[PDB]
Amino acid sequence: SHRKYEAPRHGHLGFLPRKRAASIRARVKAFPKDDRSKPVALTSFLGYKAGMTTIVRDLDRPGSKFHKREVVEAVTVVDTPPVVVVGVVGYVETPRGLRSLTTVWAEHLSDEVKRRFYKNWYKSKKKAFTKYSAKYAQDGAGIERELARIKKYASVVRVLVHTQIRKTPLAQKKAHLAEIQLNGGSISEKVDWAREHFEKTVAVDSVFEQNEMIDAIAVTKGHGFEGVTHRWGTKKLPRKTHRGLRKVACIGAWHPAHVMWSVARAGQRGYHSRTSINHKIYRVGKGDDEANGATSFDRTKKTITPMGGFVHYGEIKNDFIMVKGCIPGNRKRIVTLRKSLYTNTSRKALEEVSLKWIDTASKFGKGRFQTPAEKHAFMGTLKKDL
Amino acid sequence: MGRYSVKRYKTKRRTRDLDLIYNDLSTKESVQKLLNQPLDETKPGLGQHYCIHCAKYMETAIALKTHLKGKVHKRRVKELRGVPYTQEVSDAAAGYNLNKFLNRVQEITQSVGPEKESNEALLKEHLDSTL
Amino acid sequence: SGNGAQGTKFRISLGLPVGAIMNCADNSGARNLYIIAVKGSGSRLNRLPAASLGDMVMATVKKGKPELRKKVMPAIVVRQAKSWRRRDGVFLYFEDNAGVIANPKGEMKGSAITGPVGKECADLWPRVASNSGVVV
Amino acid sequence: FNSSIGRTAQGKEFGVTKARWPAKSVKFVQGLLQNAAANAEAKGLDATKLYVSHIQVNQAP
Amino acid sequence: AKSLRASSHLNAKSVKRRGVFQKAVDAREQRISDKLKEDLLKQKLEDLKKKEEQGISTSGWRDGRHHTYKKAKLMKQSKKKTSFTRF
């Protein structure tokens, strides 16, 4: 018979199955619609999540209770050194979908991106692309023919780029390689742009700017095997219930004589691909700026790095993106930042952010000081200083 | 964090502050008002037998006398001796409003202090005589 | 967000579920208020309706005048002991939970409020701000 | 005979997932191998060209 | 309340979207394109300064390797009768 009291079901059936992701780098499932009138532009970028900190923002939002007032907000820092363009891929349209027609690589690749092709780098003879590089000799026939094929037949053009992971504090030396779609002029213009940008770097301020809404695509933090109570949010059974209280009391009481796919079960939690949208960029910081952590209100000469560095990550020595709130994934994980798939129609997409203060206290404890000079000034002279 | 401290210093089980008690003891009118309280049916001892230092009601005058002949009361009386430690002291220690802190300290040393001491002495002799 | 409240209300940590008892901060004769319902509360299985600072509740007077007791009246929460975050950048809390008796239009029965009043409640309700002597 | 056995990466050499390290069985088989090698050496056979052409285990009482 | 898929709300959103939001998007895109061109020019200048110190038919097969591999693949498919399009 019918359930006496209505209640929404536990969990979202559209995020099934709750299995481990296939790769640590989350796939970009959709790119913004291409407009042939616009100039050539990349549709996404790669970064490494460093950590989180706190800001104070001077809010300009008409109609809000916090209009012309200060708000304290949490932000996420993504280390974004420039990426390197190493290839181009052409895609044609078929009754069975998009199909890759051909790929053209640059003549010279670095060891950072060569390591992506090896499971045992230190024992290998490092022969990858050594015969491909010989096709650039005597005017580059073959390379020219494949570029002409992409110009003649492709409907989508993607550029193959890789991260400069040596600039990060990461212990990993193997770089991450990804396809980024080119949205801009004609197919020939995209191919010419990619060819002229082979072996060249693209910085993050040549893809995004301040006050823009972006999407974060990443694999969430893993948690291993988990029970139903924390995997799905079910209510705990009463105390000393037989065979356990962290369960669902009745997984089935009705005719089908099966366990339904819609019933909560214990299993893997975390390490799933996730795409969250509409994260506002608060700052695009340059790595060569001595005071990229300072504002017009806060005159302290300091960088974005907190005292002692980011916990489990290290210092920020390159360009960075400061977006508000939180993004999926944990610290030091590779993340993909995507352009918005539509023209956002909210006023928060048009707001201009002015920051009054950036927190740089230590994240390794109850940090009270923004700089070591401030800490020394407050404490005074220690026994070892004299 | 531990259960003893949690269940003693819960916010709903909080006690009156030392600076408030010092302000109560500083002025003679406040001491007279606290000594002559209206009869309240919700208080122990009908609002009578009130120790001002500890800010505590007793059920009987004999209970108040035993409380006065005790180390807990002596501990509170010793605590209520010096500067009351308001926020100005911490500000001065940080280096903020130092002149205001110095003016407050010299006012306590000159005017408020001895008057509070004389009020305490009169209260002590009154309690000794009546009890 | 209630009738008589001035404007929208941003979310505050909930401190007072149904069944809680808070002090009465006005001078109408009540000593404490016993919460029986929360105005504008949501619907969810097993979840208790809970009040926060600036919320209107339905309360019965447990201690106070006999004529004042044995009836249900609207009240406005003006102090809570559960810490809540101000958007200026601090978490804060009071010593006690306290409210005042009002009408469905948000007008005070008494003429004055004793003790501090939260800025959120005072800015939300114009009559509380008119009768408040101490606002934070 | 492998129901409810743990899995290990050392089974990938033989294209399996379930493999173990039975020390007692290995010791008994090693003793028999050493004995067979000794018998071949007594017969005069080339020790570098010997291979296990037959091995059979059945159940004792 | 009106759903996210409500027709009149979506129509009003489209009317708003054609205006200031699209204009701001276009201005941002132009600025980003200018910065990308400047970045490429700066890399060219740095490469030139570094070198200062030191100083089409698409028909047929792609290559012989591709020709051999594809012909062998099609021959194998014909021999094993595992072709998608050819009996």
Add this chain to the structure above:
Amino acid sequence: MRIYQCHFCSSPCYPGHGIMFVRNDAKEFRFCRSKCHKAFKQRRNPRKLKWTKAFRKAAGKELAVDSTLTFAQRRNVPVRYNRELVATTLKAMARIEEIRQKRERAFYKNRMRGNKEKDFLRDKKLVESNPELLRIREVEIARKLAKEQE
């Protein structure tokens, strides 16, 4: 936006840090840390806890009265905005901080003078009182020097 000082230990309280408690007499108590907040709830004495600035100032560990310590106070009478006054204030703050640090260093050096004399007297008394271990030391050094020679 303002940097507050902890009620218990006088540490700076930056936005979004610590916790505030409001009393019945409208007195705000800001604490930089849960440590200070829990000490206050336990009603401990910051003038008796050694790790506090109140204790250090009371006991004379660091200087408390100086000209460089009278430049900061709450301004209840505002002044009209002036760009050159703001620039002058920004330079003056750095100069005042540098001078205050120099005077704090001098105060600590004056407090810690005499330690070398005390340590020397202790070392001399120990050397006088331990003759046998010194003989063992001499034997060990002589054997090591003989080993180096041969």
Add this chain to the structure above:
RNA sequence: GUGAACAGCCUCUAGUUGAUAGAAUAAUGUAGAUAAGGGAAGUCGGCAAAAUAGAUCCGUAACUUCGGGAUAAGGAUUGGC
């Protein structure tokens, strides 16, 4: 030794060091804890936990077979030198 104490805890004489082991630290369990604000709204039902506790002093109602009830209840205190 502590302590009212053949209680609990630690030690001397004497006697043991036996009970398949090793490596990791998922879910669910068995045994044991802590938790902001509220305080029985949970549940058939305060089930279970929590709270109380030794000793000194003050004080102690109805009822009663006058023997009790009674450690009624309710309060103040406890270290070291």
Add this chain to the structure above:
RNA sequence: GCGUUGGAUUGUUCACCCACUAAUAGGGAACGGCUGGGUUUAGACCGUCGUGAGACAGGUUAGUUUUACCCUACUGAUGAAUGUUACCGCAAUAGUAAUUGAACUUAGUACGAGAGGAACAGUUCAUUCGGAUAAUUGGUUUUUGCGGCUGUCUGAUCAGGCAUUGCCGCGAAGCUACCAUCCGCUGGAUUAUGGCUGAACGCCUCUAAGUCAGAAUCCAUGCUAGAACGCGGUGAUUUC
């Protein structure tokens, strides 16, 4: 499509009251796992009947049933083979998600003797749900990290053992909370209905042929997985 509540009451509730709420709609998959009523056997008492053994018009109280390691289903996790190995991708199919209220302005305007009193367009918050996240606040402590306390033991100091994590205070890191913070969209085709042209039927008619709009509906966009017997592009391919 999406929601449909929190409680009181057992000298009975085959229900009834209080309140909140956008609303507190009806029902099926049983009635063809824990748990209280109940088939509750041996103990006991009261009532009715019986000459009696006893039975009942009845009332009260106390009373051991204890899988899973099997197959399948479900949730997650590996994996042989089609030259080998590696990187970048496509997308058949399967699943799919957002919801409701209030506020500013429109405006004390339309309307109205008055009393009263809207909405579209433009903006701002919140309820329920969902997915994350740990900068801050709170919670947690075998970090046995630092300090302290009782009893005893190592002659005392120092440094330590034991008290089934001895006890007390703080406590980073990690984990975690509507107890913390962030984020959650836009194209085609339609229903009821309103129409256009227009016969049947020399009037007429939204319908017959044809056609315009139009619902939280449908199919897509977007989101999750990726056929382990679906596929493509690309790199390297062994000197005994």
Add this chain to the structure above:
RNA sequence: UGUACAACGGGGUAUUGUAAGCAGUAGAGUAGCGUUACGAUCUGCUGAGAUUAAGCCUUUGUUGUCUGAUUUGU
């Protein structure tokens, strides 16, 4: 055989709360002859001392290590 890796060491960043030893004229008093003896505790050397990756950051130092086994062809 190297912006190589590791074990230590160093510097930061954090947690706690002022180490051991020595000394004083501070210490309720008491005992012997102003002094001495005992004396909870107080004060100074001393934000000292201890811990700090085990899933913190960093590194011009010291000492070492760099290697075996199996299989795969159109």
